[PDB]
Design goal:
One of its GO terms (cellular component) is nuclear envelope. Belongs to the glycosyl hydrolase 18 family. Chitinase class V subfamily. It comes from Saccharomyces cerevisiae (strain ATCC 204508 / S288c) (Baker's yeast). The protein has 287 residues and is of the alpha/beta class. The chain has a single domain, classed as TIM Barrel. It has an eight-stranded parallel β-barrel. β2 and β3 form a beta hairpin. α3 packs across α4 and α7 runs parallel beside α9. The radius of gyration is 18 Å and the shape is globular.
């Protein structure tokens, strides 16, 4: 499809973040990226105010999120766990360490049967997003490649995504995007020279999809802030500009839709219609 909306959820950018299920029951969004597994290989999660309980060892234990992942999935939504963010608390030393970690993710969050503490109990994520922000690329391609092998053990389709910023190549997930099979790229077109109103470089990303990406069918997403306060710059309130941008980029099989930072912002920002709704509708109208 070229009409999907992806939203990050978990970090409460707007302050007023509601439960994950609240957004899945909205109908404006299709893919939900839980933000974030912010610490690894030694596991640590952070979902701002949305989960506070822990196992004895301090690892988050999130029964409401677990319930909500299942609700979301019954409603046809996909829910991926996003690795990374701005914490500064993750790194792989090498490919072998990252391959071990694939097994860890599978057993902790996927359909793996290896006995592990499960932050989401019997809920099973639909895959993983790589929002690596520390400019260290080691291991992610090996991790993604190993995950693909493990997914065959499961009983549903799994997805891998990455969240580069628009400068190409990306200094954190470039190697991953060039060397692993990735379903979705949620490309950040703001806080950078290549934003929509700057020197918009969608063309470069299209070249990447068509000629570099191991998955030729990878779907590129226009990543935007969900409100004026969701990022320093790059918020687009001009609906004519949104409309013309979508018209330009929807013209290829590589266009997947729009990704938004974050749900709390895109759902609550009204212009008096929720911003996420405005975008969902522009996508379907272009289709």
């Amino acid at each position: 499809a070229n009409t999907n909306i992806a939203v990050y959820w978990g970090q409460n950018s707007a302050g007023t973040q509601e439960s994950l299920a609240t957004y899945c029951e909205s109908s404006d969004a299709d893919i939900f990226l839980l933000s974030f597994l912010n610490q690894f290989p030694t596991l640590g999660l952070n979902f701002a105010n949305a989960c506070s309980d822990t196992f004895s060892d301090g690892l988050l234990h999130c029964t409401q999120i677990a319930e909500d992942i299942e609700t979301c999935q019954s409603l046809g939504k996909k829910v991926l766990l996003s690795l990374g963010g701005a914490s500064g608390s993750y790194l792989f030393s090498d490919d072998s360490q990252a391959e071990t970690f694939a097994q860890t993710l599978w057993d902790t969050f996927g359909e793996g049967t290896g006995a592990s503490e499960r932050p989401f109990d019997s809920a099973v994520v639909d895959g993983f997003d790589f929002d690596i922000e520390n400019n260290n690329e080691v291991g992610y391609s090996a991790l993604a490649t190993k995950l693909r092998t493990l997914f065959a053990e499961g009983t549903k389709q799994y997805y891998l995504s990455a969240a580069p910023q628009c400068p190409y190549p990306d200094a954190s997930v470039g190697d991953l995007l060039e060397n692993a099979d990735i379903d979705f790229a949620f490309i950040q077109f703001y806080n950078n020279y290549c934003s929509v109103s700057g020197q918009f470089n969608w063309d470069t990303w299209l070249t990447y999809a068509q000629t570099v990406s191991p998955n030729k069918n990878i779907k590129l997403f226009l990543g935007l802030p969900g409100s004026a306060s969701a990022a320093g710059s790059g918020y687009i309130s001009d609906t004519s500009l949104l409309e013309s941008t979508i018209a330009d980029i929807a013209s290829s099989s590589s266009f997947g839709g729009i990704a938004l930072w974050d749900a709390s912002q895109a759902f609550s920002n009204e212009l008096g219609e929720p911003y996420v709704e405005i975008l969902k509708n522009l996508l379907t109208s272009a289709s």
